């Protein structure tokens, strides 16, 4: 029936994501693992785990990378969900602008190869240059000829998890399940709407350091590892939750409301934004308004809009061959 397919599994994140999905998928599901190097290892390493009903297939890689790999093309038959997590992990001490090009190229090639067989399947991005990469996927889908404006999502639950963890730490024993987060994803476009949750907030000027932390946490993690990798576990866990939410919504066993980064229509003039939506039996069904906010966060939202405008412009105008 349902058949999730992760693109890239032998990385520092693909193995953990596959392991996590191998413990919550409904009976009778199926996995499809593809990677250039290391596919046989995960293939005949997760097949020796007892979880009845689930079948684990895989497609091996090929020689040094070549566009339009036949193995992926034949693998991608009969797939319902694609999880794009294949990208360069991290560069030793280089900021994000340099990291853009290789990820853009690889995601363009992967989307072009995958969408040519099963266009109806949903696509979920879990790379890293999110804001400037989702428009690349949109442009590729427009160029090939098929593009559903309600089946494309950029994962942003990680910042919400960080925000709720911090606010729970600062307000024990009070507990809140979710915290809304709006904007883009990269460094400052994130803004949490702490005024929209129940319970009395502690005090002003005490949420400022929280808002700084929920934006500087990624670089803090990178510093803690002394520049030899990124957060390979926390982002490996949220992606599993989001993929399960999408699959469950497709199966019709739940209709969840989730905060994601999707193309806009109607509301805020930016073509893409991280706005609350609701899932259903066929993609997105009802986009929701941001709701009542304060001017203190309204100015932050306007600045985030200004930043994401240029981010999307760069993502759309990358178009780099140079020769």
């Amino acid at each position: 029936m349902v058949n999730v397919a992760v693109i890239g599994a032998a990385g520092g994140i693909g193995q953990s994501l596959s392991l996590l999905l191998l413990r919550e998928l409904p009976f009778g599901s199926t996995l499809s693992l593809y990677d250039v190097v290391g596919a046989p290892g995960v293939a005949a390493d997760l097949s020796h785990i007892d979880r009845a009903g689930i079948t684990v297939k895989h497609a091996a890689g090929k020689l040094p990378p070549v566009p339009r790999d036949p193995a992926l093309t034949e693998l991608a038959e009969g797939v319902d969900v694609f999880v794009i997590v294949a990208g360069v992990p991290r560069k030793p001490g280089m900021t994000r602008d340099d990291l853009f090009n290789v990820n853009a190229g690889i995601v363009m090639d992967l989307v072009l190869t995958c969408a040519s067989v099963s266009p109806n399947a949903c696509f979920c991005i879990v790379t890293n240059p999110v804001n400037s990469t989702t428009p690349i996927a949109a442009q590729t889908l427009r160029k090939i000829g098929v593009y559903n404006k309600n089946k494309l999502l950029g994962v942003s639950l990680l910042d919400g998890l960080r925000a709720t963890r911090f606010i729970n730490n600062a307000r024990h024993p009070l507990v809140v399940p979710y915290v809304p987060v709006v904007g883009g994803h990269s460094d400052v476009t994130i803004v949490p709407l702490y005024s929209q949750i129940p319970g009395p907030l502690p005090d002003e000027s005490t949420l400022k350091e929280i808002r700084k932390r929920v934006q500087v946490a990624g670089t803090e993690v990178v510093k803690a590892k002394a520049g030899r990798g990124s957060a390979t576990l926390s982002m490996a866990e949220a992606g599993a939750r989001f993929t399960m939410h999408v699959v469950k919504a497709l199966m019709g066993l739940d209709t969840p409301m989730v905060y994601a980064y999707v193309d806009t229509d109607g509301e805020h003039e930016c073509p893409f934004l991280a706005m609350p939506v609701v899932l259903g039996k066929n993609g997105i069904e009802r986009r929701l308004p941001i709701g009542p906010i304060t001017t203190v966060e309204k100015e932050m939202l306007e600045e985030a809009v200004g930043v994401v405008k240029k981010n999307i412009a760069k993502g759309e105008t990358f178009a780099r061959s140079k020769l």
Partner: protein
């Protein structure tokens, strides 16, 4: 004009390889080599002449045809290095470079191309600069001096060398391609649009429309127009671009 018959100015073509456009020169070289497309010289000259004007799809085919019949020539094994490095076949480029080095000025160029293949900058440019000092000529590699630096997020430095390669031969469309994309990477859209329109007009002007100016590689040249559409959003011109007339608004 479906006809293929063109005059045979091989002398004129080799004379205009630096003092005229690379579009008419390419057409003339194709005409002079279409008679017996099997010798090493015609194929290698065709590949070298298509190196300038961007038609790498047919250029790769011509270079491979030249290579398959002579595993000793030093030029055919060198041209394939850059063109494959740009698009794809990472392993094939390395194997071609090994074969090129296994048949014994351009050593530093090949080294820098190999480094540029696996996303290595700020040092391949150094190797090129130390190479260009020995031979401050042959603007064909001067493009690399900018190109391998222009995608390293340093646009201002890349501009200078570009104009240096412009004066020797104006028909080397790669330099104006690079300056157009560099100008685009400043949010000064007209500065890139003007240059790209000039580039397509020059590469398609003259005798290009005559004699099947509908070459398939030109398709890979038409899409380049629909880059800044996001900031030329006028219904009048967005639909006109799919036919590539360029008569509307005539660049002015």
């Amino acid at each position: 004009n479906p006809y293929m018959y063109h005059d045979k100015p091989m002398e004129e073509g080799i004379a205009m390889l630096q003092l005229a456009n690379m579009a008419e020169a390419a057409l003339a070289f194709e005409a002079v080599c279409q008679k017996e497309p099997e010798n090493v010289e015609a194929w290698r000259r065709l590949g070298t002449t298509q190196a300038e004007n961007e038609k790498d799809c047919l250029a790769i085919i011509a270079l491979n045809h030249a290579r398959m019949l002579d595993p000793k020539d030093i030029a055919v094994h060198a041209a394939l290095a850059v063109s494959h490095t740009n698009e794809h076949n990472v392993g094939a480029a390395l194997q071609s470079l090994r074969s090129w080095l296994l048949s014994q000025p351009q050593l530093h160029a090949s080294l820098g191309v190999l480094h540029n293949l696996s996303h290595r900058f700020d040092e391949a440019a150094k190797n090129f600069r130390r190479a260009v000092e020995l031979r401050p000529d042959d603007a064909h590699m001067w493009n690399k001096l900018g190109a391998t630096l222009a995608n390293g997020n340093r646009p201002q430095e890349a501009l200078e060398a570009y104009n240096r390669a412009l004066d020797i031969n104006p028909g080397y469309v790669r330099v104006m391609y690079n300056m157009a994309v560099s100008y685009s990477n400043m949010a000064q859209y007209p500065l890139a649009a003007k240059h790209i329109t000039r580039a397509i007009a020059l590469q398609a002007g003259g005798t290009n429309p005559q004699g099947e100016g509908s070459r398939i590689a030109t398709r890979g040249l038409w899409d380049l127009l629909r880059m800044t559409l996001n900031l030329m959003d006028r219904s009048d011109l967005v639909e006109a671009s799919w036919q590539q007339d360029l008569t509307p608004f005539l660049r002015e």
